[PDB]
Structure 1
Amino acid sequence: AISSVLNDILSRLDPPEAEVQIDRLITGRLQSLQTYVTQQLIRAAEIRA
């Protein structure tokens, strides 16, 4: 993306095109959340043991 900062895309970039930049950034970030939670479940299982 142009910038990791959402505001630096949405603020200055033309609203049409901006959706492309934003959508890309969203996908990127969602992937880290999915990764994070997956690992936490695994760690939790170890704690249960």
Structure 2
Amino acid sequence: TLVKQLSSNFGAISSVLNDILSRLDPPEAEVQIDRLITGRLQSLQTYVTQ
């Protein structure tokens, strides 16, 4: 489950960091990267607790 949680978008346009970097400009890619970071952090917090 923890590994499968990587591929989810968590609300971002895409779930690959390199695609976000290349497709979008640096000023806007920050929000997508932040959303991905928040999602992955929440998944890691569900883990460890379990």
TM-score normalised by structure 2 residue count: 0.70
Question: Which ranges of structure 1 fall in alignment gaps of 5 or more residues?
Answer: 40-49
CA-atom RMSD in angstroms: 0.8
The one of 15, 18, 41 aligned to 1:7 = 18
Q: Give the whole-Å Cα distance in 2 for the aligned partners of 1:10 and 1:33.
A: 24
Count of aligned residue pairs for this structure pair: 39
Equivalent positions of 1:1-49 (< 5 A) are 1-39=12-50
Residues of 2 paired with 1:24 and 1:10: CA distance?
Answer: 14
SS in 2 for 1:2: coil
Higher fraction of helix: 1
TM-score (norm. length: structure 1): 0.72
Bigger radius of gyration among the two? 1
Instruction: For structure 2, list consecutive stretches of 5 or more residues without a partner in the other structure.
Output: 1-11
Q: Percent identity?
A: 100
Q: Tell which has more relative contact order, 1 or 2 (C-alpha 8 A, sep 6+).
A: 2
